[PDB]
Design a protein around this motif. Structure first.
Motif, PDB file in Angstrom:
ATOM      1  N   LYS A  29      43.003  37.907  40.516  1.00 19.64           N
ATOM      2  CA  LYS A  29      41.867  38.821  40.558  1.00 19.64           C
ATOM      3  C   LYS A  29      41.793  39.709  39.320  1.00 19.64           C
ATOM      4  N   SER A  30      42.940  40.120  38.778  1.00 22.26           N
ATOM      5  CA  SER A  30      42.901  40.953  37.579  1.00 22.26           C
ATOM      6  C   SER A  30      42.541  40.147  36.336  1.00 22.26           C
ATOM      7  N   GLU A  33      38.912  39.847  36.511  1.00 24.03           N
ATOM      8  CA  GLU A  33      38.337  41.103  36.042  1.00 24.03           C
ATOM      9  C   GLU A  33      38.299  41.166  34.521  1.00 24.03           C
ATOM     10  N   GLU A  36      35.531  38.813  33.295  1.00 24.94           N
ATOM     11  CA  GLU A  36      34.236  39.454  33.500  1.00 24.94           C
ATOM     12  C   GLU A  36      33.987  40.562  32.483  1.00 24.94           C
TER      13      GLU A  36
END
Length: 42
Positions: A29-30, A33, A36
DNA sequence: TGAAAAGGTAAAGGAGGTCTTAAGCTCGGCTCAATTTCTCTCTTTATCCTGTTAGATGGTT
Protein backbone atom coordinates in the motif's frame (compact mmCIF):
# COMPACT_ATOMS: atom_id res chain seq x y z
CA UNK A 1 12.18 6.39 3.02
CA UNK A 2 14.05 9.05 5.01
CA UNK A 3 15.38 6.25 7.21
CA UNK A 4 16.61 4.60 4.00
CA UNK A 5 18.68 7.75 3.22
CA UNK A 6 16.41 8.51 0.24
CA UNK A 7 16.50 12.31 -0.02
CA UNK A 8 15.63 13.10 -3.66
CA UNK A 9 13.17 11.93 -6.30
CA UNK A 10 16.25 10.77 -8.21
CA UNK A 11 17.18 8.55 -5.25
CA UNK A 12 13.68 7.08 -5.22
CA UNK A 13 13.87 6.57 -8.99
CA UNK A 14 17.05 4.60 -8.31
CA UNK A 15 14.88 2.00 -6.56
CA UNK A 16 12.67 -0.53 -8.30
CA UNK A 17 9.26 -1.56 -7.01
CA UNK A 18 10.97 -4.64 -5.61
CA UNK A 19 13.64 -2.51 -3.95
CA UNK A 20 10.80 -0.42 -2.55
CA UNK A 21 9.17 -3.55 -1.15
CA UNK A 22 12.49 -4.50 0.44
CA UNK A 23 12.44 -1.28 2.44
CA UNK A 24 11.93 -2.21 6.09
CA UNK A 25 8.24 -1.88 7.06
CA UNK A 26 7.39 -0.53 3.60
CA UNK A 27 4.28 -2.33 2.41
CA UNK A 28 2.53 -2.69 -0.93
CA UNK A 29 0.00 0.00 0.00
CA UNK A 30 2.84 2.44 0.68
CA UNK A 31 4.52 1.61 -2.63
CA UNK A 32 1.19 2.23 -4.35
CA UNK A 33 1.00 5.55 -2.51
CA UNK A 34 4.44 6.46 -3.85
CA UNK A 35 3.44 5.47 -7.39
CA UNK A 36 0.29 7.59 -7.13
CA UNK A 37 2.35 10.53 -5.84
CA UNK A 38 4.80 10.20 -8.72
CA UNK A 39 1.88 10.08 -11.14
CA UNK A 40 0.66 13.24 -9.40
CA UNK A 41 3.97 14.77 -10.46
CA UNK A 42 3.87 12.95 -13.80
C1' DT B 1 -3.95 29.85 38.88
C1' DG B 2 -3.20 29.35 34.26
C1' DA B 3 -0.58 27.35 31.05
C1' DA B 4 3.00 25.11 28.58
C1' DA B 5 5.06 20.40 27.72
C1' DA B 6 5.69 15.86 28.31
C1' DG B 7 3.72 11.35 28.81
C1' DG B 8 0.01 8.15 28.41
C1' DT B 9 -4.00 4.96 26.41
C1' DA B 10 -7.11 3.14 23.14
C1' DA B 11 -7.58 2.53 18.26
C1' DA B 12 -7.18 1.55 12.68
C1' DG B 13 -4.45 0.07 9.91
C1' DG B 14 -0.68 -1.78 7.92
C1' DA B 15 3.38 -5.01 7.73
C1' DG B 16 5.08 -9.33 8.45
C1' DG B 17 5.39 -13.92 9.67
C1' DT B 18 3.13 -18.09 9.99
C1' DC B 19 0.05 -21.35 8.73
C1' DT B 20 -3.50 -24.17 5.29
C1' DT B 21 -4.58 -26.77 0.53
C1' DA B 22 -4.58 -28.59 -5.31
C1' DA B 23 -0.80 -29.90 -8.66
C1' DG B 24 2.94 -32.12 -9.57
C1' DC B 25 7.03 -34.45 -9.10
C1' DT B 26 10.87 -37.85 -7.99
C1' DC B 27 12.69 -41.08 -4.93
C1' DG B 28 13.42 -45.15 -2.46
C1' DG B 29 12.08 -49.68 -1.66
C1' DC B 30 10.89 -53.98 -3.26
C1' DT B 31 11.43 -57.71 -6.35
C1' DC B 32 14.10 -60.26 -9.32
C1' DA B 33 16.96 -61.36 -13.33
C1' DA B 34 21.36 -60.76 -14.19
C1' DT B 35 25.00 -61.14 -13.64
C1' DT B 36 31.15 -59.97 -11.38
C1' DT B 37 34.33 -61.71 -7.05
C1' DC B 38 35.92 -65.51 -4.33
C1' DT B 39 37.63 -69.73 -3.01
C1' DC B 40 38.48 -74.29 -3.45
C1' DT B 41 40.38 -77.76 -6.71
C1' DC B 42 43.17 -79.28 -10.57
C1' DT B 43 46.28 -78.59 -13.71
C1' DT B 44 49.93 -76.85 -16.23
C1' DT B 45 53.47 -74.73 -17.13
C1' DA B 46 58.08 -71.82 -15.39
C1' DT B 47 62.37 -72.53 -13.48
C1' DC B 48 66.25 -75.08 -11.88
C1' DC B 49 69.32 -79.17 -11.51
C1' DT B 50 72.27 -83.14 -13.41
C1' DG B 51 74.31 -85.64 -16.95
C1' DT B 52 76.69 -86.57 -22.34
C1' DT B 53 81.87 -91.23 -23.65
C1' DA B 54 85.49 -91.83 -31.10
C1' DG B 55 89.03 -87.60 -30.82
C1' DA B 56 90.03 -83.19 -30.33
C1' DT B 57 94.57 -79.66 -26.41
C1' DG B 58 97.89 -71.61 -27.15
C1' DG B 59 93.57 -65.65 -30.36
C1' DT B 60 91.80 -61.82 -34.00
C1' DT B 61 91.64 -57.97 -35.00
Amino acid sequence: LKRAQVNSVADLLSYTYEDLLEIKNFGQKSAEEVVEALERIG
